[PDB]
From a paper:
Translation initiation in eukaryotes begins with the formation of a pre-initiation complex (PIC) containing the 40S ribosomal subunit, eIF1, eIF1A, eIF3, ternary complex (eIF2-GTP-Met-tRNAi), and eIF5. The PIC, in an open conformation, attaches to the 5′ end of the mRNA and scans to locate the start codon, whereupon it closes to arrest scanning. In the first stage of eukaryotic translation initiation, the 40S ribosomal subunit and translation initiation factors eIF1, eIF1A, and eIF3 form a complex that facilitates loading of methionyl initiator tRNA (tRNAi) onto the 40S subunit as a ternary complex (TC) with eIF2-GTP. eIF5, a GTPase activating protein (GAP) for eIF2, is thought to bind to this complex along with TC. Recognition of the start codon in the P site precipitates transition to a scanning-arrested, closed PIC with tRNAi accommodated in the P site (PIN).
In the empty 40S subunit, this channel is closed because interactions between helix h34 in the head and h18 in the body form a latch (Passmore et al., 2007) that must open to allow initial loading of mRNA on the 40S subunit. It is thought that eIF1 and eIF1A promote the formation of an open conformation of the 40S subunit conducive to scanning (Pestova et al., 1998; Pestova and Kolupaeva, 2002). The large data set and extensive classification also enabled us to determine structures of a 40S•eIF1•eIF1A complex at 3.5 Å resolution and a 40S•eIF1•eIF1A•TC complex, representing a partial 43S PIC (py43S), at 15 Å resolution, which has a conformation similar to pm43S (Hashem et al., 2013). Binding of eIF1 and eIF1A to assemble the 40S•eIF1•eIF1A complex leads to an 8° rotation of the head compared to the empty 40S subunit in 80S ribosomes (Ben-Shem et al., 2011) that likely facilitates binding of TC in the POUT state to form the 43S PIC. Notably, the latch remains closed in both the 40S•eIF1•eIF1A and py43S complexes observed here. The 40S head is further rotated 5°–6° in the structures of py43S (without eIF3) or pm43S (without eIF1/eIF1A) (Hashem et al., 2013) relative to 40S•eIF1•eIF1A, which may facilitate mRNA recruitment.
Numbering used by the authors:
A (entry chain R): 2 to 126
B (entry chain b): 2 to 82
C (entry chain a): 2 to 99
D (entry chain X): 2 to 97
E (entry chain C): 39 to 255
F (entry chain h): 1 to 25
G (entry chain W): 2 to 130
H (entry chain A): 2 to 209
The structure:
RNA sequence: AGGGGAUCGAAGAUGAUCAGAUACCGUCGUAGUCUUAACCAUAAACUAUGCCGACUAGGGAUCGGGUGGUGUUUUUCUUAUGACCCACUCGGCACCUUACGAGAAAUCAAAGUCUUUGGGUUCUGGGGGGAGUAUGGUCGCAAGGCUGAAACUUAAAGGAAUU
């Protein structure tokens, strides 16, 4: 029976976006925050919104969630992103020099007019 | 596509194209100098025979006819003219 | 208008295809407008297998399958839900579902 | 393409074909068979004088309903019998 | 007043684009109708017709009104707008806007000898929409518009003085005819005529010269 | 009425007509 | 049967132009066709064209600038009688300023303007604009 | 023309080879592609890498010519490229679109994701077809990372590539970024191999 | 086009596609202008100076736009043997 | 008109079902179904797309042939065929995706290269009914076929799509 409406969920999302710092975990505090910030007309509606926010918060502390933005999450993502392998995947060190190429590839390289450390096979069907 | 030199195309492409459909029509067939394993005589056999061509001196049958290119008689050795 | 570009038949290069009779009602239908469902049923029903096995002399026995191709005149097929009415956009799919 | 012949010496075919086709055009057919003279109560003429046989009220076709006030006339020129509508509200009692 | 979405609109507001000519040249998409208003102050709006357009429901039938509007001055600019709404006035208004948005240029030309100021079209141009094919033919001076009243009005709006027409198909469905006419008019530019042979500069677009004036910061 | 049936009817009529003609002859 | 060669050539050219190609391969090739091409070249509707020798009929490679918006033969070569040229022009050409009706006269193959200048007429061939 | 520094120098070529840009053309082949150089006896066609490099350079030259950094839109719907796109955006000026495109983005001046680009770069025509289509409606040029299989409709400048990829797309993106930067003058020299890694682009699934 | 008193009429002269020579129309919302920047020494890409190419919508729609662009480039020397004349 | 006549079966019988049911369903069942000599000349004899020719756009299939593969297998040692495999190529039955072209649209690689109208040709149509009727020919043993009207009548008959 209990499924939340647009006017609850959307509002909750907006709240989360605005105020992820200072909108934290437990219900009563969240409710109070809602009362302070949002201009909610009814009490019941406000309560519902608060509940939804709490739920969202709970969900958050287990991984990121779609549609929900907030400025800390973005920062975290950015931080995560800036990772480089020291060796590199295109280093050729894993192949122990002489990058594994085909005959055709070798020919192409030759035709370009370039000197490269090459290792040549054949490959057939 | 759009812009091409239709006059002098790539050789490979021309080769790929059907005889007739090339820039100027030319045969894909050729003539052969056929050496029979026995006697020292050279006969000029067309690659797409139709007739069972024998050496002019001795009856040996150098080529047998097929659909397109004719088949040579194993003991025989050819050289493209 | 043309409901089908195939005309619901599958012949084109032919001219006359010999008719097969319907397996359900004997409505003579061309061998291409025919709806051919090839039924490989097991000769013994799935629930009655165990009993048969128990009965049988020579344990580890093959138990054969019965084979027949069935030809349904299209109306019959429609009735018996072998074929269903599809949307204009998805009539086009010639590949079997499974 | 195009169904017709085009060649500079076709002419005759174009003519004859056109002539043949013309007969499917109804007015032309009427003109040529002369159905204005042979059939039709007026002998291909704009007007005709006749003698009034009797006055007949005719019931109109559908959507409408009203007795129309027509007159059965026998024409002087040939003797053919025709129905003729008498226009305007009174007018039927001008005929006899 | 007005506040513009789209860079072009902003540019127009600024005053960085002086005439619609530039827009026409660089095929820039006009998506705000106010631009047209700004650049062409002298647009007369002709409502061609209003017709009922119906949809069967379980209860009665929904009737909507189709407004067909032609827009233009007399200097080679015409727009054509079709709009359906339930209110008639509203429909008309929307149609006007649509027409404005559409607005196209015309290649006005001479019949024979370029004595002074072009009167006709430069080339025999056709336009086809639905079944209606509208052929427009360059007429000699002082022969007027020779057209079905609908097309004639459009021609007048465009600023063509003398033109022959050959509308064929089911011209009675007026909207289609109008569309065809519009298409034909459009076609006048896009015909490669010997007095257009020679290659020109390729100017940088007003969207690129004033890239900084574009976008609200 | 189906066209085929109409045709059939016509044919039937024509047979009778033919018979009549024959009789007359 | 290839009833008209010139017509075929013209159609091919048209097809090439419409699809935006910069070169055509005309396949049977004649005197008449060549003459027609030359007229176009003179009027600047076409680039350099060259005749491949097959030792049989021929083959023409034509470069298209893009200016030519329609060729077109008028097929049953009607005998045009000097005062009749005007009517043809009115019919076939898109304007009164430009475009050419190509007509074979005993003075040679030329555009209508040239014919007028020379005061000759003959059978019609095609048109270009 | 380019003054000799813009030749395919060995290191770059090596990198490309490692990525396997040259490899993934697939057996099936679009007729609008003469970027082919031989066909490996197995069936997989080999892309001419010099040509690809040249194309990339050309693209960069275009990108540089756009006066305002934000007016360039980089798009990817396919996951193997989203990260790369983001990286490119970060490095260049560039507005990114990752994942869902949202139709009526270039058209529809009411949308919140409404962009007015003057150049669009795409990872694939095949998968980000919608974006390409939209571009058509509003006169905006499309640089696309086509392999020898993807359709060339509305693609103005194609970079012959690998779209099976994983590494390759990312690498290409990185290269594009780098060249653009060089053109700008943000990287003062052309000889110096740039501080950051090609690996900084790429793509990694949730693993931590 | 041209009036008898010398001076031009013709409200604007239209752009022609650099690939086909075919005229680009006013509501040709498919056509494009490619700007390719003039390069200098140390790369550096000269500010506010470029080679421009107009492409009609039609070619783009067809697909042979890219090829055309390449061709255009390799006659102003912006590319070095990418497009070959003999295919 | 002979021969054959197993099955299936216009007519017929005949049992049900229905208000009726010499209709559907059931059971029989002459003619026919098969054939030999004649005749008949029509079918939604349909791709409802006349034939010949040129050109425009990709893509795989597939059948017939032919080329090139130190390609795979066969094995009686090289084999040599054959069968595959790949690539190309003419001819065919089709099909898939786009149309930048067509079209009233459904749809169409032709139904495209048509108001930017002309490659060559044969046939057919000119609102719906009356009517494929009347009549006159002619061909048929006959059934019928080919040919084919008009008077009069009528504001619609139709096509493709829509909610
Ligand atoms: Mg139906
Ligand atoms: Mg056959
Ligand atoms: Mg049949
Ligand atoms: Mg009975
Ligand atoms: Mg009974
Ligand atoms: Mg029965
Ligand atoms: Mg018939
Ligand atoms: Mg028929
Ligand atoms: Mg009739
Ligand atoms: Mg219907
Ligand atoms: Zn010997
Ligand atoms: Zn059945």
């Amino acid at each position: 029976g209990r499924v939340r409406t647009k006017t609850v969920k959307r509002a909750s999302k907006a709240l989360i976006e605005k105020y992820y710092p200072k909108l934290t975990m437990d219900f009563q505090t969240n409710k109070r925050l809602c009362d302070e910030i949002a201009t909610i007309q009814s009490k019941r509606l406000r309560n519902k919104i608060a509940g939804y926010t709490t739920h969202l918060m709970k969900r958050i502390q287990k991984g990121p969630v779609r549609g929900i933005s907030f400025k800390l999450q973005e920062e975290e993502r950015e931080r995560k992103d800036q990772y480089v392998p020291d060796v590199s995947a295109l280093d050729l060190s894993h192949s122990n020099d002489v990058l594994n190429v085909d005959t055709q590839t070798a020919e192409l390289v030759n035709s370009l007019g370039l000197k490269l450390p090459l290792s040549v096979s054949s490959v057939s069907a | 596509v759009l812009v091409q030199d239709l006059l002098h195309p790539t050789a490979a492409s021309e080769a790929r194209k059907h005889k007739l459909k090339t820039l100027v029509q030319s045969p894909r067939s050729h003539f052969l100098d056929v050496k029979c394993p026995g006697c020292l005589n050279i006969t000029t056999v067309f690659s797409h025979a139709q007739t069972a061509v024998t050496c002019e001196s001795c009856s040996t049958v150098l080529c047998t006819p097929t659909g397109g290119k004719a088949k040579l008689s194993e003991g025989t050795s050819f050289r493209r003219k | 208008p043309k409901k089908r570009a195939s005309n619901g038949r599958n012949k084109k290069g032919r001219g006359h295809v010999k008719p097969v009779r319907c397996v359900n009602c004997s409505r003579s239908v061309p061998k291409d407008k025919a709806i051919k469902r090839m039924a490989i049923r097991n000769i013994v029903e799935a629930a009655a297998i165990r009993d048969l096995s128990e009965a049988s002399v020579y344990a580890e026995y093959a138990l054969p399958k019965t084979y027949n191709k069935l030809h349904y005149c299209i109306s019959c097929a429609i009735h018996a839900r072998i074929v269903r009415v599809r949307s204009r956009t998805d009539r086009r799919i010639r590949a079997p579902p499974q | 393409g195009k169904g017709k012949p085009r060649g500079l010496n076709s002419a005759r075919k174009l003519r004859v074909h056109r002539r043949n086709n013309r007969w499917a055009e109804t007015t032309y057919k009427k003109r040529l068979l002369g159905t204005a003279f042979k059939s039709s109560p007026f002998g291909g003429s704009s007007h005709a004088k006749g003698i009034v046989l009797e006055k007949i009220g005719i019931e109109s076709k559908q959507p409408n309903s009203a007795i129309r006030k027509c007159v059965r006339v026998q024409l002087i020129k040939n003797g053919k019998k025709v129905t003729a509508f008498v226009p305007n509200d009174g007018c039927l009692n001008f005929v006899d | 007043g007005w506040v513009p979405v789209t860079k072009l609109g902003r540019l127009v507001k600024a005053g960085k684009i002086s005439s619609i000519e530039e827009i026409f040249l660089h095929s820039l998409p006009v998506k705000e109708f106010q631009i047209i208003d700004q650049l062409l102050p002298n647009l007369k709006d002709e409502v061609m017709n209003i017709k009922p357009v119906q949809k069967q429901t379980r209860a009665g039938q929904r009737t909507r009104f189709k407004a067909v509007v032609v827009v233009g001055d007399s200097n080679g600019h015409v727009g054509l707008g079709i709009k359906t709404a339930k209110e008639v006035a509203g429909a008309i208004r929307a149609g006007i806007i649509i027409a404005k948005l559409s607005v196209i240029p015309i290649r006005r030309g001479y019949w024979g000898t370029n004595l002074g100021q072009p009167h006709s079209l430069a080339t025999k141009t056709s336009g086809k929409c639905g079944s209606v094919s509208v052929r427009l033919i360059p007429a000699p001076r002082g022969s007027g518009i020779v057209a079905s009243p609908a097309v004639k009005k459009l021609m007048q709006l465009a600023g063509v003085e003398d033109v022959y027409t050959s509308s064929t198909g089911s011209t009675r469905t007026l909207e289609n005819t109008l569309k065809a006419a519009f298409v034909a008019i459009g076609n006048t530019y896009g015909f490669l005529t010997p007095n257009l042979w020679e290659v020109q500069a390729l100017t940088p677009s007003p969207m690129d010269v004033y890239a900084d004036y574009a976008t609200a910061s | 009425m189906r066209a085929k049936w109409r045709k059939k009817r016509t044919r039937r009529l024509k047979r009778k007509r033919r018979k009549v003609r024959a009789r007359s002859k | 049967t290839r009833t008209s060669v010139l017509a075929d050539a013209l159609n091919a050219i048209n097809n090439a132009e419409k699809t935006g190609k910069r070169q055509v391969l005309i396949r049977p090739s004649s005197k008449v066709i060549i003459k027609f091409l030359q007229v176009m070249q003179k009027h600047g509707y076409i680039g350099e064209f060259e005749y491949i020798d097959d030792h049989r009929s021929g083959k023409i490679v034509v470069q298209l600038n893009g200016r030519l918006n329609k060729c077109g033969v008028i097929s049953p070569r009607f005998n045009v009688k000097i005062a009749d040229v005007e009517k043809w022009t009115a019919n076939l050409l898109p304007a009164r300023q430009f475009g050419y009706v190509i007509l074979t006269t005993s003075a040679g193959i030329m555009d209508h303007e040239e014919a007028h200048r020379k005061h000759v007429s003959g059978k019609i061939l095609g048109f270009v604009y | 023309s380019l003054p000799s520094t813009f030749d395919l120098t060995s290191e770059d070529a090596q990198l490309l080879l490692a990525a396997r840009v040259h490899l993934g053309a697939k057996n099936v082949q679009v007729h609008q592609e003469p970027y082919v150089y031989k066909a490996r006896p197995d069936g997989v066609n080999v892309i001419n890498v010099g040509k690809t490099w040249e194309k990339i350079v050309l693209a960069a030259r275009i990108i540089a010519a756009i006066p305002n950094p934000e007016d360039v839109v980089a798009i990817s719907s396919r996951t193997y490229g989203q990260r790369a796109v983001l990286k490119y955006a970060a490095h260049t000026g560039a507005t990114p679109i990752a994942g869902r495109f949202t139709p009526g983005s270039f058209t529809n001046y009411i949308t919140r994701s409404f962009k007015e680009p003057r150049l669009v770069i795409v990872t694939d025509p095949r998968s980000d077809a919608q974006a390409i289509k939209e571009s058509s409606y509003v006169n905006i040029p499309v640089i696309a990372l086509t392999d020898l299989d993807s359709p060339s409709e509305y693609v103005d400048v194609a970079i012959p590539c690998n779209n099976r990829g994983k590494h390759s797309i990312g690498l290409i993106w990185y290269l594009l970024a780098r060249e653009v930067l060089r053109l700008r003058g943000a990287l003062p020299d052309r000889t110096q191999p740039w501080a950051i890694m090609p690996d900084l682009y790429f793509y990694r699934n949730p693993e931590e | 086009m041209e009036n008898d008193k010398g001076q031009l009429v013709e409200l604007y002269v239209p752009r022609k596609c650099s690939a086909t020579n075919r005229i680009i129309k006013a509501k040709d919302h498919s056509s494009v202008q490619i700007n390719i920047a003039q390069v200098d020494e140390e790369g550096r890409a000269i500010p506010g100076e470029y080679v421009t190419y107009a492409l009609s919508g039609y070619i783009r729609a067809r697909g042979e736009a890219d090829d055309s662009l390449n061709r255009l480039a390799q006659q102003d020397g912006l590319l070095k043997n990418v497009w070959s004349y003999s295919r």
